[PDB]
Design a protein around this ligand. Structure first.
Ligand SMILES: CCCCCCCCCCCCCCCCCC(=O)OC[C@H](COP(=O)([O-])OCC(O)COP(=O)([O-])OC[C@@H](COC(=O)CCCCCCCCCCCCCCCCC)OC(=O)CCCCCCCCCCCCCCCCC)OC(=O)CCCCCCCCCCCCCCCCC
Ligand SMILES: CCCCCCCCCCCCCCCCCC(=O)OC[C@H](COP(=O)([O-])OCC[N+](C)(C)C)OC(=O)CCCCCCCCCCCCCCCCC
Ligand SMILES: NC(=O)C1=CN([C@@H]2O[C@H](COP(=O)(O)OP(=O)(O)OC[C@H]3O[C@@H](n4cnc5c(N)ncnc54)[C@H](OP(=O)(O)O)[C@@H]3O)[C@@H](O)[C@H]2O)C=CC1
Ligand code: SF4
Ligand code: SF4
Ligand code: SF4
Ligand SMILES: [Zn+2]
Lengths: 206, 143, 94, 386, 288, 114, 176, 154, 94
């Protein structure tokens, strides 16, 4: 149908079979495997498995996920382990992508993946900077995006959008100073969610 | 090369003598002669030369006085009225002399250029009325 | 376009190309700045019948991910190995 | 000792300010420590307070030299979560303006690369061409740069009558302009002395450091997302991928110049193969209806009202979608919670990994070779910092 | 109060302090500190200036949008004083020179101009008036600067009886004519910090009892001029006839006048702020 | 309650790392005042350091202490390597922020905040 | 399909060797570059004589905002707040109430022109063509406050530029 | 005296406005349109506005892009090192008042909180022609200055 | 219908005007108060009521797709005119 995205059945079967393959080989760490309706394979693993799972996917002959495309974190405050660490990998040999996910909380360190992918060095610094997730055995873990001395982790869901402090130049002390934030116009929160369900296929149980 | 020099001399005559030639040279830094497409009510003159490359094929010679201001040396792009603004920026092919704008009685009869930095500048203010009416005590000391 | 015939030769020779065929300034070849009005077509869902939205609703055909394994044979690769690229037959070497 | 490269050149330059903390011994660079974040604006957190349409303009302002390519990446990600398909004419328009954008980026990448090295004349010749391509952007969108033209569902408006002929006129003469650029640089012994064997990166190191785009292809890696993982109609156009052999700045410079020629080759096919039809998905629950429908039909007005207030809801899910942006692989990890605002939007900027490799690529080079190496990576700190 | 001038906010840049102040002499040394403190808390500041607008640019960042308003005025034109003070709730006078010019002498800047500002301010209904005089002002002084300060201070008190008159000692600060004066070239001095005077002025606006009173702003320590000048050179790693006579005037003692402590301001020792003032040029005994 | 540690396996291990951080901060203040040419005294800078350590004295969670030490070391490096500018080092002192009323009556007069 | 950008082996016959030696010693490839810049000196420059000449624009150009009227003079805006809802920058602030004739009209219509991204989403969202981005782009000011437009400023912009705005809309409304 | 001062301001105002050497902070997008003003179509150099300068040789600073809190101290320091007379041109919504990142924790809501601004150029980005209009507006502002007339009347 | 208050300040079509004691009017000193003088309430009342011969009439504001959404107006009441809620034009059954 002209307006509907076509389904690719062959890639869904292929990625499912490879998902079982990885689950069978790494049972010590793999907690869940799923493939989305648009054919993206996700491996959910225990956080202890970061290095073994990423090394297997990089080096194994049937995996060869040589390129770390992205590494990010998602904050879900309702979860006991609020932070979800997402690794997106690319295999040039098999022209395929895979997503590997794990989790942690505010006080639990994750193992640095710099040994597996040098690309991860700055990504982990950004996750530390913006979410406050510590990576153990990182060559140089420090803020990368925020200002020096910045307090808090702005990408956390409970960090306010405009922050807590703002900058201006003060003539009395002849330097830029930081003061508690005041807004001439407050950001206008909108309630946009319709009170009618949109997607029955995703309904949660009562 | 002789014909090139002739064209240079025809620009002096094309500007109505040497005084009018030096006038546009020092006002506009350009001595090209074009076809007078038209003139607006403020005295701006509009010229075209389709032999020139796109972007130079249309130009305006600004008026020396607009809205009580001396613009002999002080010209700027905000002095072009909207009807000619469309033609000068090549949004259209037809000058307002050929396709005049629709008449509306709320449309400004007098165009105004940029008024920033003058006593006629815009100053923002809240357009809404007071929200909370206070209580006014009585004027008698009954107490 | 107004350059004399000698200057055209001079800059042609200096550059080594025939610059006049491919001038980087635009003259009359451009489109007219006033155009006739368009009459744009409509999409495939502009029907008066046989057009129920439940037969063409892409969002409602999305599904939650398939769970292959949950904690709650021959070896495979994530896809067949990529085929080798073939060298250009247009200009293999620059 | 210890230095700090200036924020930017003395001449006008548009790619952002960098604080580069350098360790040197004699003329040699011992360590490069890029201190970024000087253009970090919290885009990803702002996107969480926007509907999916309201967030689209944030993508023009990332790699703000490749505006429509960034839009296309975001649109493909949203269209994938929506499970819809943009109409074929929109796909051809998106590939057409994707390649026009690739020309815009490569002109900026190559001529500012020469301008920083001191070869400044080609910059002026080639931004007259960029000026004419800005006119194409403004004619379809009304804006010279930040068009917000490509959207989930297709494109905002259809091409104005007469635009394609003008694009043909520009494309007719452009190869000569590339030829003049090559006359100044390609065989110039000074240019080669500044670029050949500078910033060599091995194929394996490039992959492990997360490089993409020309940073991979300069080292001989045969990878182009338009070929291997095609999107829109890129599988219906013919072009060659330029491949380098020595992995240095000079080979990457040649790759970008050849990619410009292939973009002209692709644009030629888009102009000839442009099909008729609508420009946005005929699905008024995603794409707003025509203004004439909105003013006549009750259903159309309701859908216009809701699309421009609440916005369309995206089924819950997460996708990583990437395209072959002019600067490398540009991707978005977009998370939907079922509402009309994204839950999370991570932006994968190709220059983020590339600038992380500057320390590696500059080992045992001179202080002025760092200028060339940041040049060959083509860094825009809008996308590096978000 | 009028609903517009009810205080609102947390006292920051975007808050509403409720103060609408016209500051004459805002483009000088003391003026830039007063405007800064007024704009800090979200006040409406009217800055009448005689000078070229380029010379008022450093004042623009000192307030939120619309909070600093500039006007032109002439010391000899009362109509340009009426326009400036008409809508204000306090008028602050900081006009002055350390020398006489061809067009203005000390009888102009310190007697005729302050009187005109006070006379027009009174006629317009301004509630609060702040006038700056001098600690050593006296009609018997050998300095014509200090003699005119005495006459002007006396005339301002007649014209605006509720005016608050402040009498500082020599003020030291980054832009002063005091420590910078010595660093560029029998007597006891009690210099006072610029920020202490500024806080004193700002609290005088807020404090009700401050109306109708005269204050003297002095530092915490009295120094012999020789030692003070000796200290500057050590710290710094190293004019007119009338100016010299002021620097040699001993700083009066006025226990009958209230001071900085009475307005809630603690005086800052010259020791803690000498490097700040003097570093760019690269502990004296305190009298009991 | 069995949790993965960061560095320290108990509070006594953590307190050691805390004291090393204090020594490093204590010794750097005189250099910080000089390199940045601050107008505070060395005693003022050290008092601030004590103030910052003091307001975390109630913590009894070794993981939280490790993060506090980890964050404190990063701040020291930024200062030691001169990544901080003069403005950054002086933000600990809030020189331009007027004192905030603390008692009930003072807060009642100014506004509604408690 | 791929191609090699730099995979050529130089010919080592004495003639080719001598050709490269002449290039090194006589700088011939440097002379060639001088020819290209010389050829430009004699080309016509691309510069236009601003402000007497102007860059070409199209009817779609997104410039300064304006509030529009019906031919009767009644305001088109009905305070529906769709533009305020869609504005990606939250640059629009609207308040409304029944007018003295009962009409649904705004009492406040502000656009912070220093928040606006000039994206045109408001004029797409407007159901009555009330708010538009006009063709004016030469309205820089000397103060920040002059860029905080209220309803009077925007209505004056509509009355000022309507002659050209209406023509631009007439030229593009069939693409919308 | 009165006549000479009037003609003398006329001279120095002519010289300073006819030779405006800019320092551009190419912070972000707006620097691209700034480059297009230097490109051949508009050729800012033809007005006397040179291409490259150096902070310590510049007369006008053009803040062309978003100013973040991290960048704010460095921008103020450059402004402080400029020799006078010096002017600041605020180009685009970000520098004007924060623009599309106005509500961000890491963005200065207008560069006029850090430096005094002479001209505000609206747009996101302002077209190269819009910036040129703002630059020629600053020349008119300088043409209006009266430094010696004011000085002579002190 | 612009008018001035006792202080001489023009009143806007929204009824705004700073009262006598309001300091905020200092912003207009040496400048001007921007006021649009084509009051829409007065202009729409100059339009003549249209006479139609049906109970229901439709209004799109004129211009077809350049007007407002098309609405239908009931004219059964003979004690008042039917007004368009978008553009304010009035209709009466004849
Ligand atoms: C010290 C030396 C300098 C002083 C000597 C000055 C020499 C006389 C200059 C006269 C220029 C007049 C231009 C003109 O003809 O008006 C046409 C012009 C309008 O003509 P047009 O319709 O636009 O057509 C232009 C051509 O189509 C487009 O133009 P074009 O590119 O086709 O060329 C037109 C013409 C223009 O040539 C000239 O008029 C002068 C030629 C002398 C060459 C000097 C070297 O040239 C030719 O026809 C070819 C022969 C020119 C000599 C070629 C030598 C090239 C250099 C040799 C290689 C060296 C490489 C290094 O009218 C004007 O605008 C008048 C402007 C006057 C400019 C001021 C010149 C004064 C010189 C300074 C004196 C001090 C004050
Ligand atoms: C010693 C020799 C100095 C000679 C003075 C040079 C002044 C040149 C000049 O003013 O050009 C005319 C200028 C040119 O006018 P303009 O510079 O204002 O604008 C010209 C027109 N546009 C900008 C549109 C191109 O005339 C004046 O503006 C008056 C300035 C007088 C200054 C001379 C004081 C003596
Ligand atoms: N600073 C000190 O050490 C002490 C100062 N004081 C008093 O403090 C007040 C200000 O101190 P300070 O700020 O140092 O003085 P400044 O000279 O630093 O600034 C004086 C102000 O007065 C203005 N001014 C001067 N003459 C005239 C005039 N003829 N017409 C209009 N405005 C004029 C100046 O504006 P422009 O820039 O236009 O000239 C300037 O803004 C003065 O009254 C002084 O007597 C008292 C004791 C000590
Ligand atoms: S153009 Fe865009 S940013 Fe500006 S007011 Fe309209 S919707 Fe808001
Ligand atoms: S301008 Fe248009 S969209 Fe905005 S409130 Fe008015 S009618 Fe609604
Ligand atoms: S104002 Fe617009 S174009 Fe300029 S930097 Fe900001 S987002 Fe980019
Ligand atoms: Zn109607």
């Amino acid at each position: 149908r002209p307006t509907v995205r076509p389904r690719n059945d062959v890639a869904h079967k292929q990625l499912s079979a490879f998902g079982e393959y990885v689950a069978e080989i790494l049972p010590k760490y793999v907690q869940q495997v799923q493939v989305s309706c648009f054919n993206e394979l996700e491996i959910c693993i225990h956080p202890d498995g970061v290095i073994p799972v990423l090394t297997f996917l990089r080096d194994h002959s049937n995996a060869q996920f040589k390129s770390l495309a992205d590494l990010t974190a998602v904050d879900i405050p309702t979860r006991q382990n609020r932070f979800e660490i997402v690794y997106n990998l690319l295999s040039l040999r098999f022209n395929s992508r895979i997503r590997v996910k794990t989790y942690t909380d505010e006080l639990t360190p994750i193992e640095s993946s710099v040994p597996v992918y040098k690309a991860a060095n700055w990504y982990e610094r950004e996750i530390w900077d913006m979410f406050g997730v510590f990576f153990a055995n990182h060559p140089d873990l420090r803020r990368i995006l925020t200002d020096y001395g910045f307090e808090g982790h702005p990408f956390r869901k409970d960090f306010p959008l405009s922050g807590y402090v703002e900058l201006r130049y003060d003539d009395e002390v002849k330097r830029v100073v930081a003061e508690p934030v005041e807004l001439a116009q407050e950001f206008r929160k909108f309630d946009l969610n319709s009170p009618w369900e949109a997607f029955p296929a995703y309904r949660q149980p009562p | 090369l002789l014909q090139v020099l002739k064209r240079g001399l025809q620009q002096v005559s094309g500007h109505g003598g040497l005084r009018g030639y030096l006038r546009v040279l020092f006002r506009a830094n350009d001595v090209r002669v074009g076809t007078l497409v038209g003139e607006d009510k403020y005295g701006n003159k509009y010229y075209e030369d389709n032999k020139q490359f796109f972007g130079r094929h249309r130009w305006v010679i600004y008026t020396t006085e607009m809205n009580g201001k001396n613009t002999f040396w002080d010209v700027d792009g905000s002095m072009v009225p909207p009807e000619w603004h469309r033609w000068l920026h090549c949004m259209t092919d037809d000058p307002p002399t050929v396709k005049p704008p629709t008449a509306r009685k709320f449309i400004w009869t007098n165009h105004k250029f940029n008024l920033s930095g003058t006593p006629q500048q815009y100053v923002p203010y809240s357009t809404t009325r007071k929200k909370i009416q206070e209580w006014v005590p009585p004027s008698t000391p009954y107490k | 376009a107004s350059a004399t015939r000698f200057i055209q030769w001079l800059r042609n020779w200096a550059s080594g190309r025939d610059l006049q065929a491919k001038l980087q300034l635009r003259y009359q070849e451009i489109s007219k700045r006033t155009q006739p009005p368009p009459k744009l077509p409509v999409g495939p869902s502009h029907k008066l019948s046989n057009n129920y939205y439940c037969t063409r609703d892409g969002r409602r055909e999305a599904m939650p991910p398939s769970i292959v394994m949950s904690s709650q044979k021959k070896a495979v690769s994530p896809a067949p190995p990529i085929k080798r690229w073939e060298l250009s037959q247009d200009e293999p070497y620059l | 000792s210890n230095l700090t490269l200036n924020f930017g050149p003395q001449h006008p330059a548009a790619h952002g300010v960098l604080r580069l903390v350098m360790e040197l011994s004699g003329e040699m660079v011992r360590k490069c420590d890029p201190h970024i974040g000087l253009l970090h604006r919290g885009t990803e957190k702002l996107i969480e307070y926007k509907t999916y349409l309201q967030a689209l303009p944030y993508f023009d302002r990332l790699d703000y030299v490749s505006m429509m390519c960034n839009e296309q990446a975001y649109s493909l990600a949203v269209e994938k979560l929506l499970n819809i398909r943009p109409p074929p004419r929109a796909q051809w328009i998106r590939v057409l303006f994707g390649e026009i954008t690739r020309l815009l980026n490569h002109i900026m990448a190559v001529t500012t690369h020469a301008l920083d090295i001191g070869a400044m004349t080609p910059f002026f010749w080639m931004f007259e061409e960029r000026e004419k391509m800005f006119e194409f952007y403004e004619r379809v969108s009304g804006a010279r740069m930040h068009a917000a033209y490509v959207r989930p569902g297709g494109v905002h408006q259809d091409l104005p009558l007469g635009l394609m002929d003008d694009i043909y006129e520009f494309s007719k003469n452009f190869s000569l302009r590339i030829d003049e650029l090559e006359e100044m640089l390609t065989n110039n012994r000074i240019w080669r002395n500044r670029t050949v064997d500078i910033g060599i990166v091995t194929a394996e190191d490039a992959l492990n450091y997360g490089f993409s785009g020309v940073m991979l292809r300069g080292s001989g890696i045969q990878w182009d997302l338009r070929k291997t993982q095609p999107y829109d109609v890129y599988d219906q156009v013919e072009f060659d991928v330029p491949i380098g052999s020595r992995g240095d700045c000079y080979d990457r410079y040649l790759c970008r110049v050849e990619e410009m020629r292939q973009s002209i080759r692709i644009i030629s096919q888009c102009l000839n193969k442009m099909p008729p039809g609508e420009i946005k998905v005929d699905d008024a629950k995603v794409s707003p209806p025509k203004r004439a429908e909105m003013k006549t039909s009750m259903e159309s007005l309701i859908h216009h009202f809701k699309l421009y207030t609440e916005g369309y809801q995206v089924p819950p899910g997460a996708t990583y979608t990437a395209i072959e942006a002019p600067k490398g692989e540009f991707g978005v990890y977009l998370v939907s919670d079922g509402s009309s605002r994204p839950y999370r939007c991570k932006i994968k900027a190709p220059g983020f990994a590339h600038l992380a490799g500057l320390d590696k690529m500059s080992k045992g080079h001179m202080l002025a070779d760092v200028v060339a190496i940041i040049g060959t990576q083509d860094i825009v700190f809008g996308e590096v910092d978000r | 109060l009028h609903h517009a001038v009810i205080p609102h906010g947390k006292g920051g840049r975007s808050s509403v302090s409720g103060i609408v102040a016209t500051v004459f002499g805002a483009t000088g040394f003391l003026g830039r500190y007063v405007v800064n403190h007024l704009g800090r808390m979200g006040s409406q500041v009217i800055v009448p200036h005689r000078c070229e607008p380029y010379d008022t640019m450093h004042l623009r960042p000192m307030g939120d949008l619309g909070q600093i308003i500039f006007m032109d005025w002439n010391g000899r034109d009362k109509d340009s004083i009426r326009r400036a003070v008409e809508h204000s709730s306090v008028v602050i006078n900081l006009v002055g020179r350390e020398w006489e010019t061809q067009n203005f002498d000390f009888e102009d800047v310190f007697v005729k101009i302050p009187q005109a500002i006070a006379q027009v301010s009174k006629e317009a209904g301004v509630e609060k008036f702040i006038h700056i005089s001098h600690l050593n002002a006296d009609i018997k002084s050998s300095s014509k600067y200090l003699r005119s300060k005495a006459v002007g201070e006396k005339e301002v008190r007649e014209t605006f009886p509720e005016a608050t008159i402040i009498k500082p000692a020599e003020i030291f600060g980054r832009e002063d004519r005091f420590l910078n004066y010595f660093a560029n070239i029998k007597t006891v001095k009690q210099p006072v910090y610029i920020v202490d005077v500024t806080k004193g002025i700002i609290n005088a606006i807020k404090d009700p009892d401050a109306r109708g009173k005269t204050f003297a702003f002095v530092g915490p320590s009295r120094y012999l001029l020789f030692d003070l000048v000796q200290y500057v050179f050590a710290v710094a790693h190293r004019t007119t006839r009338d100016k010299v006579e002021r620097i040699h005037t001993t700083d009066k003692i006025l226990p009958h006048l209230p001071g900085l402590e009475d307005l809630g301001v603690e005086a800052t020792p010259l020791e803690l702020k000498a490097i700040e003032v003097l570093r760019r040029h690269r502990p004296a005994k305190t009298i009991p | 309650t069995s949790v993965k540690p960061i560095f320290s396996r108990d509070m006594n291990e953590a307190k050691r790392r805390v004291r090393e951080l204090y020594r490093a901060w204590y010794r750097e203040v005189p250099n910080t005042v000089h390199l940045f040419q601050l107008d505070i005294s060395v005693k003022q800078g050290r008092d601030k350091v004590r103030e910052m350590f003091k307001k975390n004295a109630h913590i009894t969670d070794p993981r939280v202490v490790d993060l506090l030490v980890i964050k404190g070391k990063m701040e020291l490096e930024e200062t030691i390597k001169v990544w901080k500018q003069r403005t950054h080092v002086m933000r600990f002192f809030h020189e331009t922020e007027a004192p905030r009323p603390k008692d009930f009556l003072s807060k009642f007069y100014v506004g509604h905040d408690p | 399909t791929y191609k090699y950008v730099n995979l050529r082996e130089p010919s080592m016959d004495m003639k080719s060797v001598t050709d490269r030696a002449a290039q090194t010693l006589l700088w011939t490839e440097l002379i060639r570059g001088l020819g290209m810049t010389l050829s430009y000196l004699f080309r016509e420059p691309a510069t236009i004589n601003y402000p007497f000449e102007k860059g070409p624009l199209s009817p779609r150009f997104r410039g300064e905002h304006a509030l529009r009227r019906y031919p009767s003079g009644e305001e088109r805006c009905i305070a529906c707040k769709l533009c305020e809802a869609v504005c990606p920058a939250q640059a629009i602030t609207i308040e409304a109430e029944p007018r003295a004739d009962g009409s649904r009209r705004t009492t406040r219509y502000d656009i912070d022109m220093t928040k606006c991204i000039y994206c045109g989403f408001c004029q797409e969202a407007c159901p009555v063509d009330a708010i538009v981005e006009g063709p004016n782009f030469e309205f820089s000011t000397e103060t920040h406050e002059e860029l905080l437009y209220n309803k009077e400023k925007l209505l004056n912009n509509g009355d000022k530029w309507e002659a050209e705005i209406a023509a631009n809309i007439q030229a593009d409304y069939l693409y919308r | 005296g009165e006549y000479v001062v009037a003609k003398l301001d006329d001279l120095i105002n002519w010289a300073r406005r006819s030779s405006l050497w800019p320092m551009t902070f190419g912070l972000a997008c707006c620097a691209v349109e700034m480059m297009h003003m230097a490109a051949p179509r508009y050729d800012m150099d033809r007005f006397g506005v040179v291409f490259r300068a150096s902070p310590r040789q510049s007369d006008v600073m053009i803040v062309a892009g978003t100013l973040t809190n991290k960048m704010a101290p460095a921008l103020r320091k450059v402004y402080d090192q400029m020799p006078e007379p010096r002017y600041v041109v605020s180009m685009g919504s970000c520098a004007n008042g924060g623009g599309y990142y106005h509500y961000s924790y890491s963005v200065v809501r207008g560069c006029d909180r850090i430096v005094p601004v002479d001209i505000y150029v609206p747009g996101c980005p302002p077209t190269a022609e819009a910036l040129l209009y703002g630059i020629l507006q600053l020349q008119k502002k300088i043409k209006r200055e009266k430094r010696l007339r004011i000085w002579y009347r002190r | 219908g612009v008018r001035t208050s006792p202080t001489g300040e023009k009143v806007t079509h929204t009824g705004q005007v700073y009262d006598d004691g309001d300091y905020r009017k200092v912003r207009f000193v040496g400048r001007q108060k921007e006021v649009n003088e084509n009051f829409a309430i007065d202009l729409i009342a100059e339009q003549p009521v249209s006479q139609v011969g049906s109970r229901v009439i439709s209004c799109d504001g004129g211009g077809g797709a350049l007007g407002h959404p098309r609405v239908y107006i009931n004219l059964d009441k003979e004690t008042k005119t039917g007004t368009c809620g978008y553009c304010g034009l009035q209709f009466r059954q004849q």
